[PDB]
Ligand binder design. Structure first.
Ligand code: HEB
Ligand SMILES: Nc1ncnc2c1ncn2[C@@H]1O[C@H](COP(=O)(O)OP(=O)(O)NP(=O)(O)O)[C@@H](O)[C@H]1O
Ligand SMILES: Nc1ncnc2c1ncn2[C@@H]1O[C@H](COP(=O)(O)OP(=O)(O)NP(=O)(O)O)[C@@H](O)[C@H]1O
Ligand SMILES: [Mg+2]
Ligand SMILES: [Mg+2]
Lengths: 572, 580
C-alpha cells in the first residue's frame, strides 16, 4: 500500500468533498441501523406493554423517529450516490492531468519499449481503476469504521459488556479480514496478471503469424500452447473467485456470531435489570442490521489489490527519468538555421543493433535536402535526433553553428516544425486541429492556408467547426497528409523537416504537395526524408542511406551520372 | 437494438444451463434458510421477552438457529462457486467459438484489423461478460424467488404484514420505469456529446509526440481539464435522475419497515385490529416481519449494485455479436491428397479469387507452370500479383478450375497440401519463442547439424554472433532489423525440401548487404522445385524460365525474359520504379 502515496495526495485537493460523500455514507448507514433497531424495540416495547398499558405508552415520539429515520435513509442514499460520484469524477480530472503531465516529457523515448496501442490502452485502464479507490476501498472502509463506533458508543449507554462485543466483533472483521484476504490473494493476483499478459502475447503471435503458422504446420501446436495458457489462466481466476466466495461465507458467519452472542449474552441482563425486557430486541436487531455497514468491506480486499497493482504499473511508467533534458537558459529564435551533423551514433536502449551509425551531413540555409533509403534504414531515427526525442551516443549535432542540446525547449519547437510519418488526427474540431500549430492564428488566415494546400473540400458545410477525428468525418489517407503540411505552414519554423510525405498516395496527388513543398517552403531548409523517388530534381544534395549509414550523397545528376547505389535502384 | 444484445446474451446462457439452474435452485434453498433463521429468531425472542424463559432452557432453538446460519453461509459460499463456474464456461466457450472463427477465416481476414485489436475482442470483450453470468443473471433469479418466499411465509402468520411488503411490489417497478423516462431525455441528447468525451483522454495520449513536436503539451492539459470537467457535468444530468431509481427502492424499503413497525406496534397496543386471523398477534408474528422486511428488498437492492456487471456485458456483447454474424468466405476444403513429393505443376483458367467479404480480388487469368520450372511474377502495385500467391496457399477461395499435379485444389486437403508448400512472404512474421524455434518451425525436432546448415545456407550466421544470447535469443527482446528478420524467415522457408516454393517479395525492404545475401540463397533454392517468385525489379530476370505480368488481376504475358524484353509489348522494364 506504499504505491498509493503519490496518488493519495491528488485526493487531498478535493478532501472537503470526498469527506462529504463519506459522511452521507455514514448517515445513510446509520438511518438503516436506526430504523430497524428502533422498530425492533418498538414492537417489543409495545407488546410487553400490551393492551393494559396502551395509554401510558407514548407512541408519538418513536413514530416521529421512524418518520425521520426513513426520510434520511432515502435522501441520504440519493445524495451519497451523487456527491460520491461527483467527487470521483473530479478526482479523475486530477488523475488524467497528473498522468498526462508526467507522461509528456517521456513521450517518444520512455514509451518506445512497450507497444503504443497496447500500452496506452493499459494506461487509460489504470487511471480508471485509481478512481475505484474512493468508491470501492476508502468509502466502504472508512464509512464502515465510524458507523461501528457510533453504534458502539450509542449502545454503550445501555450496557458496556454488550456494546463492546459488537464493537469487538465488528472491528476485528473490519481490521483483520481485509488484510488477511488481501494477503491470501496476493499470490494469485501476481500469478493472474502474468498469465493474462502471457496469453495476450501468445494470441498476438498466433494471429499475426497466422499465415506462417498454417503453412509450416505449426498453427495447431501453437493453438494448443495458447489454449493451455488459457487453462492455467482460468485456474488463477478460479482460485480468485473461490476466495471471494470464502470472504462472503465469513462475513455471514461473523454476522451470525454477533446475532447469536447478543441473543445469548443479552439474555442474562442488559445493564442493571436482570430481566432485559424490550432491550434484548434492541441489541439483537442492532447486531442483525449493523452488518449492512460491513457488506461492502467483504469485496474491498479485491478492489484494493487491483489499485495497488495499477498504482505500481503507472508509478513505474511515470517515474522514468527522461532521456533528454532541456536547458533553462533563454534564447532568441533565429530564422535561416543551418543544420549540421558530425558523426552521430545512436543505439536504441536495451539493444545491440546500431540503428544509426556514423552519419554526418551539412544543410546550409535555404538548401532543400532529400534523404532516400530503403525501409528500416534508420532514416526516421535520424529525424528523431533533430527533434531531441533521443540523444546520440558519441555524436554531435549543431543547429546554426551551436549545439542543439543548448536550445531552450520552447524555443526549439519554434525553430523546428516537422510533418510526422504517422499523421495524427485529434478528435477535436478542424479549427482546433490547425490552431495546434499556431495558437493565436486568426480564423481567416487559418482558412486561406487550408485553402492553398488544396484542401478546400474540408471548408464546405461549416468545415471549420466540423468534428473530424475519432467521433466522425475521418479524413482519407490522401488528404490526411495534406493536413500535416497545413500544420507545418501555420507553425512557420525556419527548418521544416519532413518524414515520408507523399507516402501511401497516388501519382496525381503526390505531385501536388511535392510541388507545394517546394512552392511555399522556398525560404525553408526542408531536409525531406522519403523512400519514394519522385521530382527530386528540385532537391539539391540528395543523400542515400542504407542500414543506418549514408552510402553516397550529391546533387541529383551526380549520383545518376556516377555509377552508384541511387542510379542502380532508380531503374529496375 | 440494445434489447437485441440482451436477447443475444441470454441466448448464450444455454451453454451452462446446468450451472445456472443450480444457482437458480440455490437461490431457493437460500431463500428458505433466510425464513428459517427468521422464524427461529422470532420464536426465540418471544420466549425471552414474553415468557421470560431463561436462555439455557430454550437451548434447542439456538442449536437449530446456529445450524441454520452455518447452512446459509455454506449455500452462499456454494452458489458463488457455482455462479463463477457458470460464468467461466460461457467465456471458455465463446472464446473457443471466436478463435475457431478466426482460424477458419484465415490470414486474409485477420489482417483487416491490428492484432492488438483482435486481442481486445478475445481478452477483454470476453472477460467482460463474466459478471453478467456469474453474478447478475443468478441475482436476477434470486430477486424473484426470495421476495416470493418471504411473502408466502408471512401470509399464514398475518396477511396484513404480507400485504405491506407485496404492496410495494408493483409500486417499485412502476416508478423506476417512470424514471426510464429521463433516461431517454438525458441519455438521448447527451448520447453524442458524451461519446466525443470518452476517448478524449486516449486520443491525447495517442498523439503526445504530435503535441510534443508543436510544444502544445502544456496547453492541451487545459483541453483535458475542459473536457473532463464538461464530461462530469454532462453525465450528472443522467445521474441526477438515474439515482432516483435507486432512491425509490431505498424509499420503499423504508416505508415497508416503517409500516410493518407501525402496524404491528399499534396492533399489540390494540389501537387497530384488522390483520391476523382472529387468533391474536403473537410477538413472534411481528419479529418475523421485521427480520424479513429488509430481506424482502435485499436481493433487489443487490441487483442494483450489479449495474456495472450489466453495463460491461452490454458494451462487450455489442462488438461480439457483429463479429459472430458477419458473412465470410472461408476457403472450400476437401480430402484429396497427393503423395508426389516431386515438384508439382500448377494449371489455372478463369480464377476469380475472392476476398473473405465476397469482393473479387484478381480477375480472370489463365496460365500453366510445368514441374521444375521457376516463373517470376511481376506487375504494378496492386495488380493481383500478391493475391495469386495466397490463392495457391489456401487463404483465398477461387472460382475457376486450378490443378496441382493433375488434381484440383479446392478438394485438396489443406493439411496435406501445405506440407508440400513453402513460402516467405512480404512483411514476414516470426511467431515463435526464439530465433532457433523460428528456423525449426517446419520440423521442431531437427538435429543440430541440419539446423546449422540452414542457418549457414541462408547466411544467418553472419549477424548471429553480434546478437545478445546467440542463436537462442528471444525475438520486444531483441528487435531484429528487417535485414535480419528476413534472413531467418528465409532459413525457415528452405529448411526442408518442398514441392512448390512461393517467395512473395524476398529482396524488397532489405538493406544492400542482405539483398545480395538473401537472393544468393534464393536463386539456388529456386532451382530445386517450382517457384512462383514475385518481384518488381527485372534487372536480373534472364535466368528465370518464365515471366508473367499481371495488370488489374489479369495475366497478359508469358515466355522467357529474352523474348519478352525485345518484344516491347506491355513491358514495364522501361518504367523506373517509384517506390524504390
Ligand atoms: C452511467 C454513468 C455512470 C458512470 C460513468 C459511472 C462511473 C463509476 N461508478 Fe457507478 N452507477 C451508475 C451510473 C454510472 N456510474 C448507476 C446508475 C448506479 C445505480 C446503482 C444504485 O442504484 O445505487 C451506480 C452504482 C455504483 C456503485 C454502487 C454499487 C456498489 O456499491 O457495488 C458503485 C460502487 C459505483 C462505482 C463507480 C465508479 C468507480 C465509477 C468510475 C469513477 N457505481
Ligand atoms: N522504437 C524502437 N525500439 C527499438 N528498436 C527500434 C525502434 N525503432 C526502430 N528500431 C530498430 O531500428 C530500426 C529503425 O528504423 P527506422 O529508422 O525508424 O525506419 P525508417 O528508416 O524510418 N523506415 P520505416 O519503418 O518504413 O518508417 C528498425 O528497423 C529496428 O531495427
Ligand atoms: N483482405 C484483402 N486481401 C487482399 N486484397 C485485398 C484485401 N482487401 C482489399 N484488397 C485489395 O485487393 C487488391 C489486390 O491487391 P494485391 O494484389 O494483394 O496487391 P499486392 O500485390 O499486395 N501489392 P504490393 O504489395 O504493393 O506488391 C487491392 O486493391 C487491395 O487493396
Ligand atoms: Mg519512418
Ligand atoms: Mg504484395
Amino acid at each position: 500500500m506504499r504505491a498509493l502515496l503519490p496518488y493519495l495526495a491528488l485526493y487531498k485537493r478535493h478532501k472537503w468533498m470526498l469527506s462529504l460523500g463519506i459522511v452521507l455514507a455514514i448517515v445513510t448507514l446509520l438511518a438503516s441501523i436506526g430504523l430497524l433497531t428502533l422498530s425492533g424495540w418498538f414492537l417489543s416495547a409495545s407488546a410487553v406493554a400490551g393492551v393494559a398499558g396502551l395509554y401510558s405508552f407514548n407512541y408519538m415520539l418513536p413514530a416521529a423517529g421512524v418518520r425521520g429515520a426513513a426520510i434520511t435513509r432515502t435522501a441520504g442514499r440519493y445524495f451519497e450516490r451523487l456527491v460520491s460520484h461527483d467527487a470521483t469524477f473530479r478526482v479523475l480530472q486530477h488523475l488524467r492531468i497528473y498522468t498526462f503531465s508526467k507522461l509528456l516529457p517521456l513521450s517518444p523515448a520512455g514509451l518506445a519499449r512497450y507497444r503504443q496501442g497496447e500500452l496506452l490502452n493499459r494506461v487509460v485502464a489504470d487511471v480508471d481503476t485509481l478512481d475505484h479507490l474512493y468508491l470501492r476501498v476508502i468509502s466502504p472502509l472508512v464509512g464502515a469504521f465510524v458507523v461501528i463506533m457510533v453504534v458502539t458508543i450509542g449502545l454503550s449507554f445501555l450496557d458496556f459488556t454488550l456494546a463492546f462485543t459488537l464493537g469487538g466483533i465488528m472491528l476485528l472483521t473490519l481490521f483483520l479480514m481485509p488484510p488477511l484476504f488481501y494477503r491470501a490473494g496476493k499470490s494469485t493476483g501476481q500469478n493472474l496478471t502474468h498469465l493474462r499478459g502471457q496469453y495476450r502475447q501468445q494470441l498476438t503471435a498466433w494471429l499475426q503469424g497466422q499465415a506462417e503458422l498454417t503453412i509450416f504446420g505449426a498453427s495447431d501446436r501453437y493453438r494448443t500452447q495458447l489454449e493451455n495458457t488459457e487453462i492455467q489462466w482460468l485456474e488463477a481466476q478460479r482460485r480468485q473467485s473461490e476466495l471471494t466466495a470464502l470472504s462472503q461465507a465469513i462475513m455471514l458467519l461473523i454476522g451470525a456470531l454477533a446475532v447469536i452472542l447478543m441473543l445469548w449474552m443479552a439474555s442474562g441482563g442488559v445493564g442493571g435489570n436482570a430481566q432485559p425486557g424490550a432491550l434484548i430486541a434492541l441489541f439483537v436487531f442492532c447486531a442483525l442490521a449493523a452488518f449492512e455497514a460491513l457488506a461492502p468491506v467483504t469485496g474491498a480486499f479485491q478492489h484494493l489489490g487491483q489499485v495497488i497493482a495499477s498504482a505500481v504499473r503507472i508509478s513505474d511508467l511515470t517515474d522514468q527519468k527522461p532521456e533528454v533534458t532541456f536547458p533553462d537558459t533563454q534564447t532568441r529564435v533565429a530564422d535561416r538555421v543551418s543544420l549540421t551533423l558530425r558523426d552521430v551514433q545512436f543505439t536504441y536502449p536495451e539493444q545491440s543493433q546500431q540503428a544509426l551509425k556514423g552519419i554526418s551531413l551539412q544543410v546550409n540555409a535555404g538548401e532543400h535536402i532529400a534523404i532516400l533509403g530503403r525501409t528500416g534504414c534508420g532514416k526516421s531515427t535520424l529525424l528523431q535526433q533533430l527533434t531531441r526525442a533521443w540523444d546520440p551516443q558519441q555524436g554531435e549535432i549543431l543547429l546554426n553553428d551551436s549545439p542543439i542540446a543548448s536550445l531552450n525547449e520552447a524555443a526549439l519547437r519554434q525553430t523546428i516544425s516537422v510533418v510526422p510519418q504517422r499523421v495524427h488526427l485529434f478528435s477535436a474540431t478542424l479549427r482546433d486541429n490547425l490552431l495546434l500549430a499556431s495558437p493565436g492564428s486568426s480564423d481567416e488566415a487559418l482558412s486561406e492556408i487550408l485553402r492553398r494546400v488544396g484542401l478546400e473540400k474540408l471548408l464546405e458545410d461549416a468545415g471549420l467547426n466540423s468534428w473530424l477525428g475519432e467521433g466522425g468525418r475521418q479524413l482519407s489517407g490522401g488528404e490526411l497528409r495534406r493536413l500535416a503540411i497545413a500544420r507545418a505552414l501555420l507553425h512557420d519554423a525556419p527548418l521544416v523537416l519532413l518524414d515520408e510525405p507523399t507516402e501511401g498516395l497516388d501519382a496525381t496527388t503526390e505531385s501536388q504537395i511535392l510541388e507545394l513543398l517546394a512552392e511555399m517552403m522556398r525560404e525553408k531548409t526542408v531536409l525531406m526524408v522519403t523512400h519514394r523517388l519522385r521530382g527530386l530534381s528540385r532537391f539539391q544534395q540528395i543523400i542515400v542511406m542504407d542500414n543506418g549509414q549514408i552510402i553516397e550523397q550529391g546533387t541529383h545528376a551526380e549520383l545518376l551520372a556516377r555509377q552508384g547505389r541511387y542510379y542502380q535502384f532508380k531503374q529496375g | 437494438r440494445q434489447k437485441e444484445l440482451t436477447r443475444w446474451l441470454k441466448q448464450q446462457s444455454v451453454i451452462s444451463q446446468r450451472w445456472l439452474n443450480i444457482s437458480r435452485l440455490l437461490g431457493f434453498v437460500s431463500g428458505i434458510l433466510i425464513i428459517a433463521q427468521a422464524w427461529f429468531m422470532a420464536r426465540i425472542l418471544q420466549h425471552m421477552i414474553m415468557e421470560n424463559i431463561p436462555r439455557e432452557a430454550l437451548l434447542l432453538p439456538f442449536t437449530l438457529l446456529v445450524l441454520t446460519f452455518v447452512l446459509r453461509a455454506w449455500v452462499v459460499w456454494l452458489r458463488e462457486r457455482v455462479g463463477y463456474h457458470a460464468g467461466q464456461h460461457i467465456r471458455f466457450a465463446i472464446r473457443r467459438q471466436v478463435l475457431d472463427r478466426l482460424q477458419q477465416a484465415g490470414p486474409a481476414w485477420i489482417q483487416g484489423k491490428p492484432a492488438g485489436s483482435w486481442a481486445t475482442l478475445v481478452l477483454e470483450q470476453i472477460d467482460d461478460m463474466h459478471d453478467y453470468y456469474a453474478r447478475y443473471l443468478p441475482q436476477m433469479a434470486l430477486a424473484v424467488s426470495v421476495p416470493l418466499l418471504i411473502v408466502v411465509a408471512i401470509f399464514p402468520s398475518n396477511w396484513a404484514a404480507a400485504l405491506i411488503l407485496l404492496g410495494t411490489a408493483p409500486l417499485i417497478p412502476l416508478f423506476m420505469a417512470l424514471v426510464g423516462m429521463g433516461a431517454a431525455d438525458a441519455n438521448r441528447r447527451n448520447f453524442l456529446a458524451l461519446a466525443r468525451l470518452s476517448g478524449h483522454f486516449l486520443d491525447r495520449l495517442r498523439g503526445m509526440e504530435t503535441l510534443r513536436i508543436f510544444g502544445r503539451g502544456e496547453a492541451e492539459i487545459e483541453s483535458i481539464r475542459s473536457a473532463s470537467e464538461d464530461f462530469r457535468q454532462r453525465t450528472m444530468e443522467v445521474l441526477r435522475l438515474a439515482f432516483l431509481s435507486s432512491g425509490i427502492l431505498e424509499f420503499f424499503t423504508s416505508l415497508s419497515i416503517a409500516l410493518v413497525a407501525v402496524y404491528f406496534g399499534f396492533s399489540y397496543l390494540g389501537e387497530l385490529d384488522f390483520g391476523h386471523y382472529d387468533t391474536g398477534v403473537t410477538l413472534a408474528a411481528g419479529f418475523l416481519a421485521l427480520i424479513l422486511a429488509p430481506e424482502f428488498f435485499q436481493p433487489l437492492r443487490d441487483l442494483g449494485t450489479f449495474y456495472h456487471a450489466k453495463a460491461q456485458a452490454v458494451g462487450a456483447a455489442d462488438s461480439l455479436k457483429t463479429f459472430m454474424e458477419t458473412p465470410l468466405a472461408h476457403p472450400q476444403r476437401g480430402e484429396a491428397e497427393l503423395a508426389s513429393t516431386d515438384p508439382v505443376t500448377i494449371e489455372a483458367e478463369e480464377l476469380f479469387i475472392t476476398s473473405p467479404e465476397g469482393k473479387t480480388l484478381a480477375g480472370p487469368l489463365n496460365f500453366t507452370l510445368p514441374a521444375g520450372q521457376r516463373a517470376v511474377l511481376v506487375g504494378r502495385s496492386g495488380s493481383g500479383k500478391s493475391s495469386l500467391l495466397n490463392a495457391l496457399s489456401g487463404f483465398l477461395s477461387y472460382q475457376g478450375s486450378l490443378r496441382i499435379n493433375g488434381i484440383e485444389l479446392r478438394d485438396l486437403s489443406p493439411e496435406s497440401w501445405r506440407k508440400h508448400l513453402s513460402w516467405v512472404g512480404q512483411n514476414p512474421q516470426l511467431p515463435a519463442a526464439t530465433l532457433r524455434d523460428n528456423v525449426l518451425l517446419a520440423r521442431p525436432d531437427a538435429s543440430e547439424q541440419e539446423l546449422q546448415a540452414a542457418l549457414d545456407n541462408a547466411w544467418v550466421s553472419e549477424f548471429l554472433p553480434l546478437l545478445p544470447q546467440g542463436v537462442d535469443t528471444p525475438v520486444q527482446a531483441a528487435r531484429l532489423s528487417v535485414g535480419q528478420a528476413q534472413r531467418v524467415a528465409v532459413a525457415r522457408a528452405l529448411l526442408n525440401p518442398c514441392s512448390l516454393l512461393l517467395l512473395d517479395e524476398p529482396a524488397a525492404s532489405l538493406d544492400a548487404h542482405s539483398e545480395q545475401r538473401v537472393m544468393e540463397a534464393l536463386n539456388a533454392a529456386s532451382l530445386r522445385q517450382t517457384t512462383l517468385m514475385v518481384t518488381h525489379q527485372l534487372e536480373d530476370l534472364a535466368d528465370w524460365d518464365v515471366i508473367w505480368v499481371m495488370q488489374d488481376g489479369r495475366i497478359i504475358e508469358q515466355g522467357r525474359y529474352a523474348e519478352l524484353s525485345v518484344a516491347g509489348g506491355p513491358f514495364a522494364t522501361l518504367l523506373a520504379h517509384r517506390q524504390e
